[PDB]
Curated annotation (Swiss-Prot):
Other remarks on this protein: This is the first (November 2015) reported plasmid-mediated resistance to polymyxin antibiotics; although it does not confer a high MIC it protects against colistin treatment in a mouse infection model. Colistin is one of the last-resort antibiotics available for multidrug-resistant Gram-negative bacteria such as K.pneumoniae, P.aeruginosa and Acinetobacter. First identified from a pig farm in Shanghai, China in July 2013, retrospective screening detects the gene in (slowly) increasing proportions between 2011 and 2015 from pigs and chickens, and also in hospitalized patients in China.
Oligomeric and partner information: Monomer.
Protein name: Phosphatidylethanolamine transferase Mcr-1
Range within the parent protein: 219 to 541 of 541
Effect of substituting residue 177 to A: Abolishes transfer of phosphoethanolamine (PEA) to a lipid A analog in vitro. Almost abolishes resistance of E.coli strains Rosetta or TOP10 to colistin and polymyxin B, by comparison with the same strain expressing wild-type mcr-1
Keyword Nucleotide-binding: no
Membrane topology: Multi-pass membrane protein
Function, in words: Probably catalyzes the addition of a phosphoethanolamine moiety to lipid A. Phosphoethanolamine modification of lipid A confers polymyxin resistance. Confers resistance to polymyxin-type antibiotics such as colistin; in the E.coli strain W3110.
Consequence when changing residue 111 to A: Abolishes transfer of phosphoethanolamine (PEA) to a lipid A analog in vitro. Almost abolishes resistance of E.coli strain Rosetta to polymyxin B, by comparison with the same strain expressing wild-type mcr-1
Location(s), subcellular: Cell inner membrane
Length: 323
């Protein structure tokens, strides 16, 4: 292991102040420009719109254009300019640090896996929610695909087992993963019709492709809202907050490009312009940065440290999503 934050210290501890409980939704394939709050023509986040204390960040650029590249970068100490995907798994990352400091780290995954981020931590702290052995919400559609909201079931059990400790829960979404956007949401979210249902996306009618994509965002709006509602059930005992950031965007036919994964050197803007949301309860004292702050995935690690009152010199200078 190559360390970067052996100096990290937690300035206040959960025996001397309210324990802190944070959900970090690690999003998938969502584009900033399809978010209502960023000026999109459709109301793709109706439920998040009803919740007080949500900040939408309108200028966030991902570290890369794929899950394998972006996800380790989101938790890295090195920042986009120095990040090396090929050695990321041997670097101390922000979850390693928080775990060393006693913060209970949980990682539930309805996407693939943590792309190496959790590899140094006990395997019991990672749970596969793509399978009904863990996920109780899979038989709600014709494909029997486990839904992101199932990652919230049994979270009370985890909180009860970590009573009084600081907790950081990562929920790795299936989200808007393509090509089969139409599979990504239950029928209650099929608001925009007709929808593309083919694997050759260039052969779908463009509007029908957009419709499937936007319906998948409605299901993610629901999942994020439900995550906040779950946190709210613990707000008297815990200082609760929710961070959402997508791993990358998506091309939807611009210049004949589909899906993602374009190398950064020529990646179109749509693959790197991602949404970010931050919610916190009024008791926590956490203050969001300005909604239009120029931000990147580099802001994630200092945000997670600040949420737990941790300082590490490697990122002391670094802009976060919060003050
Ligand atoms: Au991804």
């Amino acid at each position: 292991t190559i360390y970067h934050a052996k100096d990290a210290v937690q300035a206040t501890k959960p025996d001397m102040r309210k324990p802190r409980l944070v959900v970090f939704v690690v999003g998938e394939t969502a584009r900033a420009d399809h978010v209502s709050f960023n000026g999109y023509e459709r109301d793709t986040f109706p439920q998040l719109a009803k919740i007080d204390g949500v900040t939408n960040f309108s200028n966030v650029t991902s570290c890369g254009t794929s899950t394998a590249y972006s996800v380790p970068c989101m938790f890295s100490y090195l920042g986009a300019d120095e990040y090396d995907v090929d050695t990321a798994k041997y670097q101390e990352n922000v979850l390693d640090t928080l775990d060393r400091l006693g913060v209970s780290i949980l990682w539930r995954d309805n996407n693939s896996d943590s792309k190496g981020v959790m590899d140094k931590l006990p395997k019991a702290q990672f749970a596969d929610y793509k399978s009904a052995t863990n996920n109780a919400i899979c038989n709600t559609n014709p494909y029997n695909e486990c839904r992101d909201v199932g990652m919230l079931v049994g979270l009370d059990d985890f909180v009860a087992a970590n009573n009084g400790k600081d907790m950081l829960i990562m929920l790795h979404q299936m989200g808007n993963h393509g090509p089969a956007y139409f599979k990504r949401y239950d029928e209650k979210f099929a608001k925009f019709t007709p929808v593309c249902e083919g694997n050759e996306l260039a052969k779908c009618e463009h509007q029908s492709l957009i419709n499937a994509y936007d319906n998948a965002l409605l299901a993610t709006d629901d999942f994020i809202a439900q995550s906040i509602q779950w946190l709210q059930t613990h707000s008297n005992a815990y200082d609760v907050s929710m961070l959402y950031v997508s791993d990358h965007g998506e091309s939807l036919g611009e210049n004949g490009v589909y899906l993602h994964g374009m190398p950064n050197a020529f990646a179109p803007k749509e693959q790197r312009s991602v949404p970010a949301f931050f919610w916190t309860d009024k008791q926590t004292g956490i203050t969001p940065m300005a909604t239009d702050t120029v931000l990147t995935h580099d802001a994630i690690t200092p945000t997670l440290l600040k949420l737990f009152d941790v300082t590490a010199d490697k990122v002391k200078d670094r802009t976060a999503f919060i003050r």
